[PDB]
Every structure is written in C-alpha cells, then in structure tokens.
Design a binder for this molecule. Structure first.
Ligand SMILES: C#Cc1cn([C@H]2C[C@H](O)[C@@H](CO)O2)c(=O)[nH]c1=O
Ligand SMILES: C#Cc1cn([C@H]2C[C@H](O)[C@@H](CO)O2)c(=O)[nH]c1=O
Lengths: 315, 310
C-alpha cells in the first residue's frame, strides 16, 4: 500500500502555527503535500455568524459582570460546538481511509489544529475562565472521536513574554486581547502534552486520583497527575457526597485517557523566525508515524477532500 | 470463541410508554443475564445541569410567546442537548472497545432506554423543525455520532397520534410541558428516521437523489435528508456546502448499518413487553473482545442504572 503522513499543528493561538504550516507545504510538490487550514469561513459565516467575535465578546461581558456565568456558559458551549464541526466532519470522513501504522509517503496532510482543540482545549480553558461548566467540557471530551492510527500532533513552545508581545501585535477580527485566556490556553496545552507523556509512561489516573490537591512529550520522566489534564476535573460539581467522582464523569476521564494515549506528540520551538520554525518542523517530521491507506484510490480521494475543505472553508 | 452480547436500544418519541414497557421486560429473564439501562434522569435534573428538561420546554414556550428570539432559543437549546446526550455518549464510548464482531442464547442482554442518536440526531432535528435550533448545530451533532458498532439494534415505537397524545398526557417528565407541536415534530423525525434506514439499506444514495428534492425504497423527500434542504446550508447557487454534504455522508454511514425494529405500543403494557421479547429473535448479537468483558459491561450498566436512573 502507498502510505500517508498526517501532521496536526496545534496549540495556543498567536504562536505562528498557521504561518509555519504554510511555509512547510510551500516546500513540497503540489500533489504530494496538502494544507488543511483553520475553517475560518465556517466559523465566520457558514456555521454561524462571527463565532470568534461571539466567543471573545461573551467572555468580556462576563468579566464586566453584564451577563451571568450561566448565560456565558450556554453561549460558549454552543459556540464551541460550532467551532469544532468542520474538524469533526473531516475526521469522520477521513477515518475509513486510514489503515495501520507503517520511505517517503505518497501523501502528506498538514492540518491546522486537531479536533481536540475545539473538543477539549478551548472548552477546558473556557472552564478555567469561568465561562463553561466542567460537565460540559466532559461532554465534549466524551464526543472526541476515536484516535486514528498515525496521529502526530505538534504542540508549540514559546516564552509567555514573547507570546504576549506576539499576541499584542496581532489583530484578528472578533478577537479581543485577553491575557487571562492566553494564560489559560497555554496552561491547558502544557497539561495536554504532559497527559500524553503520563499515559505513555503507564500512568493510570484512577490509581493516582488521590494524589490530587491543587513541558514536553515523547521525552522525559512520568509527570505527576497534578501536572496533567486530570487535575482540572477535581471540581466540586463533579464530586459525590462520598467525595469521589461520580461514575459518569470518571467514565469521561477514561475516554480522555484512551484518546490521548495513542497520540504521537512533538514539541516545536516557536521562539525563532518563520523560516526557522519551518525548518525546525521539517526535521521533526523525520520521526513521525505514517500509516497505510485502505484503498489504492484513497490518496486522491483524501487529496480532493483536503483541497475542497481548504477552498471552501479557508480564509 | 468469546461469549455473546445482545444490545437493544428502545427509542422513539417520548410519551409512548417506552420506559414502563421495558421495566416489566427486565423482570422476566434472570436478574443476572439481563440489565436495564434506564434514562439518565438524575444526570438531566442534577448531575450535568439543573433541571435540563424544564430548561428545554420553558425555552420553547418563551420562544413561542415571543419573549425570546430564534437565536437566544437556539443557543439555549444547543447547550441543553449536549447535557442530555452526555451519559449516552460516555456509555457508548466505554462500551465500544468491548464490542466484537457479529456472532446459543446471549451471555448478556443489555436493554437501553434510548440510543445516542436520540440526543445527537432526533431531538436536535425536531427542535430545528420547532424553530429553536439551527440546522448547522444539528449537523454538528450528526458529525459527532459515534461509529455504528456491530449489533446495534434500535426498537422504534408505533402508536396512532390520538392514542399517543393520551399517553403523553400521563407520561410527562419533571419540568415538561404538553406540546402537541413538539409531539408532531418528534413523531415526524422518528418517522423520517425509520424511512432513512430503509432508504439507505435498499441502496439509496442521497447525492444521486438530491436533485429530486428540488424537482424500491422511500422517496428522499420522505427521509431525514429532506430536512437539510435548508437555506442556511446552501450556497448562493443552491448547492449544499461541502462541509454539510460531508455531514450527510456521515449520517448515511451511521444509519445504514443500524438494525431497526418496530414495536407496536397500541396495546397493554404486558403485551408491549411480550412483543418486545419476540422482536429479539431477529436481533443481531455480537461477541465481546475480552474474557472479562461480560461482567465489566454488567458493572457499567448496573452503576449507570444506580447513579443516574430516577
Ligand atoms: C479550533 C479552535 C478554536 C479556536 N478558538 C479561537 C482561538 C483564536 O482566537 C481563533 C482562531 O484560532 O479562534 C476558540 O476560541 N475556540 C476553538 O475551539
Ligand atoms: C435522549 C434524549 C432527549 C430527551 N428529551 C426529552 C423528551 C422528554 O420530554 C424527556 C425524557 O425523554 O426529555 C429531550 O428534550 N432531548 C433529548 O435529547
């Protein structure tokens, strides 16, 4: 079988991921590498009207005390549903084409973000921002699609000092500069990296749950559970009278563990120039898991889908 | 050769008697080899959020009275459906690794009160018909429907409208409001749902038949696909955006491999149970994947029952 390489570039916004993805794709031949962008058109028009604007305005009105936590929660929750839709449909239609893990790949797909950004990371960060309930975050978690073979996720590293500067220069439509949220999303993705590493080192959250009382992966020692995403869900809403988690929520953490544990995580240093990031990323692709496809004509099919998506939903 | 499992999801519009019927069925067979997974009422009322059902009907009423907008109702409705579906989504997700391929009576029989597509497809779709959910939110939920495992048997109900209205009047959940328009909306969706499975199973291709919505198996105008000829989903030239079209490809994949069975509810509670029992003879069993899958699955079902059933 001809092989496929899927690479998801993810992390907090404002690091330079989108630039890097494009520079990477620009190096390859037209028909052997494809770019799958953020579905901005879906976010802005097709799925709903100006969703990103909605998200930032809602947080702001919560901060100012013009709307309650409950009102913010219903708006955040449905906005996040909108945010994630194109990532979910795409994952669902790619799924039947992916075979076992496996010499240049016949096709490379570079994604701007993985489904877990909209289905886990931003929800979790909004929870920390007090604009979502942890129960709803766990409902998103339980709906995370099965983790396909060869899921390489690249997360970013960037000093908070540089990140804030970089963010303060940016001007994306609908966004408001919010360093509280920036701190939250950076913490959330750091926990994520740690959660994969913890899981891959044999860590079991049920065995470690009692240790709770409040980065990098594919390297280093097993993290403490308090430095993983599990620590977020020791919330009084989720706890039974006896002090343990209600089973329904523990089952969602089991789902979180199953999804994250088979992922191949790499860290990219964004503290450099765009061409630097690009070449740093290129080197990282060397140690990345490829997969087979299930039909010989899966490669063109997958190619059309990626280009159709890019054309329809890219900015 | 691993032991066998029978999964039976009893579904359909509310107010037909689905939850009485099943409780009785869970009395005949040995308490050990059959488990009744009830409606997660405790999650709906307390665990996930405060009185979700009340929240849902009150929102539709307020929109009906023109006290809130289509948009305000939709954001409220969407979040609430997420809450409603959560226990269904976790359960399916933890059960999946345990499901083997298709297959001596079943070592274990699970009877669920509803399947994940109730909260992920049917109710969202009915609320869309009710003007309180956007068709893009619906296809978002569709996009998240877990892949259809082997042996997914769904029992749907049949009941004449007037008789159903009578039962609804006495089977009102806490916070619920009697709404004959939602009743009709939800009955139509489940009607279209049954048609959609047949359409797909008989070889129907939505992309091929799509043009017929604007100009042997049901007509596409009698399937769930007709609902998504909504102007919100369409480009200036009438075409479906690809992202929605793909969500329709997922919907087709998911429903095609479900095994649907119709249970006539227009009879005595005892007769409903008897009918449900003989319906099981045609249902698909699966093996499980590990030796200890059976008692683990049992524990899941019993714990769900204990923690979330009212
Ligand atoms: C994917 C994604 C998401 C992006 N965003 C924001 C981050 C940036 O401000 C902008 C573009 O990535 O949207 C969310 O608020 N939620 C998400 O789920
Ligand atoms: C499952 C389920 C759902 C049930 N319901 C309602 C229908 C009944 O009034 C009550 C219990 O079935 O909840 C929803 O409104 N949405 C759902 O997703």
């Amino acid at each position: 079988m001809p092989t496929l390489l899927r690479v998801y570039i993810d992390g907090p916004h404002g690091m330079g991921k989108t630039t890097t993805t494009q520079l990477l794709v620009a190096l390859g031949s037209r028909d052997d590498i494809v770019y799958v962008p953020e579905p901005m058109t879906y976010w802005r028009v097709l799925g709903a009207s100006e969703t990103i604007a909605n998200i930032y305005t809602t947080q702001h009105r919560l901060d100012q005390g013009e709307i309650s936590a409950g009102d913010a929660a219903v708006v955040m929750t449905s906005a996040q549903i909108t945010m994630g839709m194109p990532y979910a449909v795409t994952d669902a239609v790619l799924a039947p084409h992916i075979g076992g893990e496996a010499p240049p790949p016949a096709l490379t797909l570079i994604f701007d973000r993985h489904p877990i950004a909209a289905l886990l990371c931003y929800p979790a960060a909004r929870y920390l921002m007090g604009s979502m309930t942890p129960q709803a975050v766990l409902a998103f978690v339980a709906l995370i699609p099965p983790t396909l073979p060869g899921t390489n996720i690249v997360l970013g590293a960037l000093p908070e000092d540089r990140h804030i500067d970089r963010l303060a220069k940016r001007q994306r439509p609908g966004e408001r500069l919010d360093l509280a949220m920036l701190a939250a999303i950076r913490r959330v993705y750091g926990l994520l990296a740690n959660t994969v590493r913890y899981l891959q080192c044999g860590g079991s959250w049920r065995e470690d749950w009692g240790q709770l009382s409040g980065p990098q992966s594919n390297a280093g020692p097993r993290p403490h559970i308090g430095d993983t995403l599990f620590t977020l869900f020791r919330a009084p809403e989720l706890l039974a009278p006896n002090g343990d988690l209600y089973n329904v929520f523990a089952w969602a953490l089991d789902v979180l563990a199953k999804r994250l544990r088979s992922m191949h995580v790499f860290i990219l240093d964004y503290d450099q120039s765009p061409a630097g990031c690009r070449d740093a990323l290129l080197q990282l692709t060397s140690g990345m898991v490829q997969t087979h496809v299930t039909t010989p004509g899966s490669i063109p099919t997958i190619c059309d889908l990626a280009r159709t998506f890019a054309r329809e939903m890219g900015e």
